[model samples]
Target chain A: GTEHDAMRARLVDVAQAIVEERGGAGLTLSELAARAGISQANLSRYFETREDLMEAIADYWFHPMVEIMEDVLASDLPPRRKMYEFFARRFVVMRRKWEADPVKLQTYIEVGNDYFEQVRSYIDLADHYLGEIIGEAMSDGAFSGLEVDETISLVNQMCAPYCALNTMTTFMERLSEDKLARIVDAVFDGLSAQDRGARSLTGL
Target chain B: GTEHDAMRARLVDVAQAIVEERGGAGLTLSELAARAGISQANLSRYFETREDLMEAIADYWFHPMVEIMEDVLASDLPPRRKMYEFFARRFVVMRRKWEADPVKLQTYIEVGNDYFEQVRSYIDLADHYLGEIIGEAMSDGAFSGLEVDETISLVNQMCAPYCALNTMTTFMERLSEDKLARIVDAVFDGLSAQDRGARS
Candidate 1:
């Protein structure tokens, strides 16, 4: 069991490195086998197909973030704070990955595109945790007057650019903790000028 | 000049069809030439390099959006109204394209990625006009407490998902006109629970 686990980890590392250098298209079973110092047939024992291996890599990269979300959901923090911590901490994890190897994030995005169904399942998992937090917040009288599903949708939309790597790299040079806080705060506090009243009133 | 203009337009149309069906990587000069019923030599006369052709495609896709921004800038509408119309109208344009052919939007995005520098120039052009409208609104005492650059950045961030096609297609089934207004309105009216006071 220990040996199997170690070999699986080693294969993923080799595949991820290859993916980082030349994208998902560049990775091949034979090349990965040679790089990992194993025969192709042996490698297939761990991962039967390229899709299987890609799912494994996605799991390796994404599972930690999911764990963090689970931890936040289980923590003693207030509902809103839990929501903030969930995203803030996730951003820090992504930022670290971006700093360590920018290519990894881009490659991860490429993998998501190539294997969207697998990635979508992971997204649904995260969103479920997020929904639980939102439900807690709404129960506490926060996010009043907002529909739960629509609020979740809006919140996700606001956070979408940060989560979606291409939008982040293309639009923002860097996302500081404070900037992240402000954007999150804007969602909660509203960005409208209070004195001007709601823009909806102006008949624009 | 007339013949050259018509030939160039035809080449772009044929190339765009290929891109829409098979993506940017699927495009090759010989293939494009054959599809357009022009010799490779004649194709060279229009676009000397693959990069040149790609730029032309980006221009074809993005130029109309820039023209819309320019039109909004020149219109007689008020600052905030201008801002709303700019994005609202742009969404309509994109939505129509998506409705007609969803792959076209994806391919346009692919082209933008493959030729980001060309796309960035168009973005800069749009941002300049956006800045002008934001400045006008601020001068009119709208967005009173917000810094111009940061507000622009925030506004752009809010609008980023809608403009960036992948996020739209991935997250949303369809973005309606009213939904577009609500988002643009949120930027102005703010999404905060007013009674809860500023989260700041």
Candidate 2:
């Protein structure tokens, strides 16, 4: 397991450079092994193919994002505050890192193209972790009457477009902070428990 | 310009079939010319390069989406219902066409990888059309205490993931209709005007 992991680590190192340098078009196991000071046969012990290497690269980049979500969920913030902070933090980090660095951002998109199955896996993992928080918040009256899984679906879907497609960077880059805050304020307010019931009564 | 348009049209017809049958991965100038019964040189006359062809495909696929958004904005429905229907309709169409056909979806994604500049163009175009409606809703007292542009940012950001990432179909497929309705209700309700000043 350790040997496999080190090989994997080496592969990610080489792959990230390739992606950043040439936009992921130049990544190949043969080239990767050449750069990492290992034979292609040796590299195959860790990654079975080009796709496998890209999957590892995607996993490597996405790991931190998942960890941040985990820590946010575990923190002592109130459910409403937690949701606000969760989205805000995600926006800030993604905008800072991915938006400012075109090469890094482009690299992620490249992997997304080839490694969607892995992306699906990571998304499900987020669902599992984030679902508990949504469930608890709803029961605690942070959200109004709704099924927990349904609420989870809403959060995931809303977040996915920007988060999954990596396009929130564009949003951050183009909009003034004043503009972004208003949107954020509305989004957080909209998800409040009362809005769900109140809007229907107005019947508009 | 007429000649250019005609050639562009034929290229899309062939490209769509190639994408449907083999996904975008197998699409190339050679294969396209082969399938369309033209020489590769003639095919190059229409689109100078493969990126040129895929750019055309991307435009072809995205044009209908923008028009639908435009029409939804023009509809006489209440701003609130319009917002709901706007996003809901977009999701349904994308799911129905792109999801049912993996090859088609993959073809789109493949082009997306190579031509993000084009992808950015379509996204901005959607933002422009959808932004008007979002702004109108906010100004009309549909959403309170939020600037129009801010609301625009929220809607665009929220919807982009599913639309851009091509995952709404997954959401539609995996969740029950009842589950989806609740999610939809919460999303639309969250955007309601009362959520800000009236609640507390």
Candidate 3:
């Protein structure tokens, strides 16, 4: 049992290093086995298919963020503040990774797309927490008059471009923590020149 | 002169069709030459390089929307309404194209990515007009307290995902005309719970 756990950890570490250096497409079973100093058959005993190994890698990457989200959800901050902190912290994490190694950032994007089903389950889990946080905030009279699902959708729309990393690079080259905070503020505060109290806009 | 113009159009059409059926990777020079009923040597006369043809395809796809944007800028609508109409109409155009054939939509995304420099020039032209319109709107006191460049950047951030067509598909699957209008509303009209006048 001890040997199996140690081997599993070693395989994941080796596989993650390969992915980080060369992206998802560059990682292959034969290469992984050779790099890990294990026989191909020995590798198959741990990861029956490449897909299983990919899912494991996704889990390894996403697990820390999941834990961070759980911590935020369990924190004593107000619901609205918790929501802001959740996305803000995520941006910080992503920005750090991007700054540390641009290739690793691209590798992350590639992994998400290449293993979308596994990645999406993690995204879904995060969104579930987000929805709950939004609901709690609404009950406390924040984001009033906005439906929970619609608000979640709106936030997703606003944030999706940043998450994709490649879509809006031209405009987002100078993105900063302060700008991110303002963007969140703009979403909650609305942008109309007219008084929000007097507006007949459908969602407002 | 007539022969050259006709040949150029034919090459672009053939290349576009090939890309639609099989993505950018599928449209090799040899395949394009074979399909266009021209020898590869003859094809080179029109496009010295595949990049040239790819740029031509990007132009072919983006040119019509450029015209639509130009027309919107020239219309008599208020600057804010003009901004709304510009994006709304763009969505409708993209939606119609997507409905007709999804592969074509993916091809459009692929072409934009594969030929970004050319597509970006066209995008810059559109943003130039958008900057003017946003300037006019801010001057008219529409988006008060928001810098014109930042506002433009914000709108771009909000709309970029939709343009990519692949991102956020799960939540956007049920997207409709009304939903688009509401999303635009949510952007223009702030989403704050407090009254706009009383808030800090």
* Local accuracy of candidate 1 as per-residue lDDT tens digits, B24-129: 5678899999998889998999998889997787777676687788888898887767777777777777777778888787776777666667777887777778
Evaluation by lDDT, superior candidate among 1 and 2? 1
Per-residue lDDT tens digits for candidate 2, residues A1-204, read 887777678779788778767756777668888999989888888887787777677777667677778887888766655555555566566666565676566565665666677677777877786677777676766556556666666666656533554455444465433333333344444554333321243543
User: What TM-score is obtained for chain B in each of the predicted models?
Assistant: 0.77, 0.68, 0.72
TM-score of 3: 0.71
> Over 4 Å off in model 1, which ranges?
A1-61, A111-118, A140-144, A191-204, B1-61, B112-118, B140-144, B172-174, B191-200
**Ranking of predictions according to TM-score:** 3, 1, 2
Superior by lDDT: candidate 1 or candidate 3:
1
Instruction: Return the top candidate by DockQ.
Output: 3
DockQ of candidate 2 against the true complex: 0.16
Higher DockQ: candidate 2 or 3?
A: 3
**DockQ, model 3, C-alpha based:** 0.19
List model 3 lDDT by residue over B21-138, tens digit each.
Answer: 7865677889888988889999999999988987788778677678788888998776656666677677777777677886677777677666666678877887788888878866
Any runs in candidate 2 off by more than 4 Å, and if so which?
A1-67, A105-125, A165-188, A191-203, B1-63, B108-125, B165-200
Please name the candidate that would achieve the greatest lDDT relative to the true structure.
1
The share of true interface contacts that also appear in candidate 1 amounts to 0.18
lDDT of 2 by residue, B51-157 (tens): 88877876676666677778888887666556665566666665665657755666656655565666678777776766677677666656555566666666665
* Each prediction's whole-model lDDT (CA): 0.71, 0.63, 0.69
Docking class of 3: incorrect
